[PDB]
Amino acid sequence: PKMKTHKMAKRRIKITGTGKVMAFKSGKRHQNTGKSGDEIRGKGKGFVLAKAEWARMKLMLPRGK
Amino acid sequence: PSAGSHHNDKLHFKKGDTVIVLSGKHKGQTGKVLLALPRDQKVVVEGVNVITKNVKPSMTNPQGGQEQRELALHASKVALVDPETGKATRVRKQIVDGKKVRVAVASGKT
Amino acid sequence: AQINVIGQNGGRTIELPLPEVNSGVLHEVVTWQLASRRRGTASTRTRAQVSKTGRKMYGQKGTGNARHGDRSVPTFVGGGVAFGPKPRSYDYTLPRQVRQLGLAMAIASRQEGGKLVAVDGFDIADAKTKNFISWAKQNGLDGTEKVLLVTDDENTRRAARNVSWVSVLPVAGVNVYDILRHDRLVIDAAALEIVEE
Amino acid sequence: PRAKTGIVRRRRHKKVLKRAKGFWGSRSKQYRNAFQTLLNAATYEYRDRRNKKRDFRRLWIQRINAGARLHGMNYSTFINGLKRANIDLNRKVLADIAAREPEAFKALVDASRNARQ
């Protein structure tokens, strides 16, 4: 059986050139009028997971994409 | 798993033929084929010979009584002989007449 | 780097698998080889496969007995095998270059023997084993060795075969096993100037 | 291929059992209780190698004290007596002197009470 790709992880995770794993910062959908404008700015973004969380994601998409 | 199975139920000699005893205790003694059973591959030759016992039965006769009769042998200790050589001999199938198949050696025939 | 016998004597060709032949790669090639031909035909029954009804034998608690559900179980005499062999296959694809380097290194090994004997033409009358025996005898094949013969001529093979100590191989039926199995190799030689280039 | 037990289990078993002769009742005839008895035997063997070294020292000491006191001396005072006069004897040996050779042990006594004076 070919190991399947974890379709949830498709739109939320990114493989990197070196071989680290990325995602988008969170809290941006109704936690808005908070705000602060620098939070709202800092959140829409993107960023690298701390580390412990790497193996799993890697196993989520074997193809990298 | 019958004895003839290995030898295709086939006798390499007929009844009434003379035979030399190849192997065993009666090496080389000679005799007439008195009885030959193909499927079992067993053959009687006036030379083997044992002492059998008739136990109780009042037929034949109340008392026991012992007896001297030959005990059949396994085909593979039997061979056709060759009047010249006089010895243990193989066989070739050649022809005669008038539709008869016959048996030769290295110098036919028996 | 070596001579023929009957109908010429060239053979200085063929580069060879140095340093002085390696057994490691040989091993690779041979175990692969035997693996490739295993029947993989061992087969046993498991719990699903034993003819035992699946009905519960008696009550889960009560009885005073230990608990069981079925008599088709691997802790049960006459049951299933827990972890038996089912028919499988062992045949993989060893990298080509390694098969090639192998065969090569076989010939090379048998060269430093020197148990190579390159041969041209032969001379066995018309398909007779006695004549194979005399031919062999003229070439130093006493009988005290096991010999692999490779040729494309129907009748020379047809003459060797029935000899206990000769194993007979047509064309490119060659392989590291069969070779390394035997002592002497009859190459022949016609195939050698092509199996260099 | 399959590989039965064939022969191994019985060889193991007989090994244990044959270690176990002279054991009482089932302890020498049933495998498991043999094997078991033997675990405890393990403990006892190891222990008692050390412990017999403990025991014999004891014995020597007893005898020594005895001889010491025959000639009017305690053991302890006898042994400081010996160390003082730098006589350097094993107590195994001191015991054997004490038990086997009277006059000699006597001489060591006098030497030691001298070393004490």
């Binding site: 739109r11 989520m60 | - | 091993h27 | -």
Partner: protein
């Protein structure tokens, strides 16, 4: 029969169980627990019963395959090919085997000698540096 495999080619497997040698009793598995048990399952992305990291993270953007360009470098074509030239069926026989995708040329490292190239697109600084060395770049019609 003479032969032997390489030291360190073949490690003998783990036979867990088989006595106090040895991994006794529990065969690695530890004492009790769901991990101890014998069943196919958990599996791998199951944290606690909780609420999973991947499930807590925002999805971004759709998905699209689009077209992907097969990369050819300068530095490849340059230094030591001695221009056997590009064409179409020539590149393959040298080294840039793909099919099904259009070819692109990108800057890489260095340019000097002039060559004629046949790609499907290329970068600005690549056409610029290939011309400034005397070579032309061919895009299709």
């Amino acid at each position: 029969h003479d032969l032997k495999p390489t030291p360190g080619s073949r490690k003998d497997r783990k036979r867990v169980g088989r006595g106090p040698g040895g991994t006794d009793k529990t065969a690695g598995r530890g004492h009790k627990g769901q991990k101890s048990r014998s069943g196919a399952g958990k599996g791998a992305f199951f944290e606690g019963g909780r609420s999973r990291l991947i499930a807590r993270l925002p999805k971004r953007g759709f998905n699209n395959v689009g077209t992907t360009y097969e990369v050819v470098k300068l530095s490849q074509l340059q230094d030591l090919e001695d221009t056997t030239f590009d064409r179409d069926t020539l590149e393959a026989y040298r080294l840039v085997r793909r099919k099904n995708r259009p070819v692109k040329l990108l800057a890489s490292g260095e340019i000097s000698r002039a060559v004629t190239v046949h790609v499907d697109a290329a970068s600005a600084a690549a056409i610029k540096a290939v011309e400034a060395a005397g070579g032309r770049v061919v895009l299709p019609e």
